[PDB]
């Protein structure tokens, strides 16, 4: 019993973290097979960031231009390519400690683990949801660039994020593993702002189901609301609309608790309307939208 915001075990990823130095900049890289991936802005400086042209910047550099150290061992760069906002550096050695993996583009509301690493060394692991506005609420400090997010399916590792920068709000932006940014953000040190976010309804409901699964049922009621009637409320409170597809997704959870999706949608409407009056759900003051249905199941 119990429900906690967990993370995937990070060992498999740890094995693939390395340090990349270029000029006066050091950040992390990911080393899979003979490739090491890192943010393209590593080649930037105290000034280029201000307004760079990556292509120019790139060819004034070479394989000697980057120092890649794994553990205490230097590594030989022989190739450099650029893929979107990422850098690909080839190396002489195919990592022995390379696990089954694939690259995926995470979709909003899905969640992943982040292994925060400084200087090629892993510092911590935490769980993160991709916000609707394409940012994540992470804990990152300078030098954390190149840290990645991932999910694990059994043995396989799907990589879904690499860290690039921090927005003015203190939230983070990065790319998938083909260097394509999440959101419209670009790698320039210039004003950029997070769009106004919204709450992930499907996740809040799954969370409610978990709570029921976990014995706090205080927020239930015998009422029911329509799919359109609820959405009207959701709109009012900056919640995302519920759709039939999302209702379908919740079905197993509904079944397990014997709690219709719309009823739960009723309970929510009420909670939205009346608050919690100082009550706790799963030891939580406010509705929590960072667990997917899938997460809830894998934990119950």
């Amino acid at each position: 019993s119990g429900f906690r915001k967990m993370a995937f075990p990070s060992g498999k990823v740890e094995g693939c973290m390395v340090q990349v130095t270029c000029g006066t900049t050091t950040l992390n890289g990911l080393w899979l097979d003979d490739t090491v991936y890192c943010p393209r802005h590593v080649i930037c400086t105290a000034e280029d960031m201000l307004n760079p042209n990556y292509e120019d910047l790139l060819i004034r550099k070479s394989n000697h231009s980057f120092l890649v150290q794994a553990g205490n061992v230097q590594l030989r760069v022989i190739g450099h390519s650029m893929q979107n906002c990422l850098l690909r550096l080839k190396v002489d050695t195919s990592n022995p400690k390379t696990p089954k993996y694939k690259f995926v583009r995470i979709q909003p509301g899905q969640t992943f683990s982040v292994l925060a690493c400084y200087n090629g060394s892993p510092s911590g692991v935490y769980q993160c949801a991709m916000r609707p506005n394409h940012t994540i609420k992470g804990s990152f400090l300078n030098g954390s660039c190149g840290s990645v997010g991932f999910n694990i399916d059994y043995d396989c590792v799907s990589f879904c994020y690499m860290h690039h920068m921090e927005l003015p709000t203190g939230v983070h932006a990065g790319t998938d593993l083909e260097g394509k940014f999440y959101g419209p953000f670009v790698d320039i040190q210039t004003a950029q702002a997070a769009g106004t976010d919204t709450t992930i309804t499907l996740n809040v409901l799954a969370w409610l189901y978990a709570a029921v699964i976990n014995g706090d049922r205080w927020f239930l009621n015998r009422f029911t609301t329509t799919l359109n009637d609820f959405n009207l409320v959701a709109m009012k409170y900056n919640y995302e609309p519920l759709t039939q597809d999302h209702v379908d997704i919740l079905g197993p959870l509904s079944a397990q608790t014997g709690i219709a999706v719309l009823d739960m949608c009723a309970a929510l409407k009420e909670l939205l309307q009346n608050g919690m009056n100082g009550r706790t759900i799963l030891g939580s003051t406010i509705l929590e939208d960072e667990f997917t249905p899938f997460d809830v199941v894998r934990q119950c």
């Binding site: 300078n142 660039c145 690039h164 920068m165 953000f185 950029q192």
Partner: peptide, 5 residues
């Protein structure tokens, strides 16, 4: 503005 990490 955006801060690189």
């Amino acid at each position: 503005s955006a801060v690189a990490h």
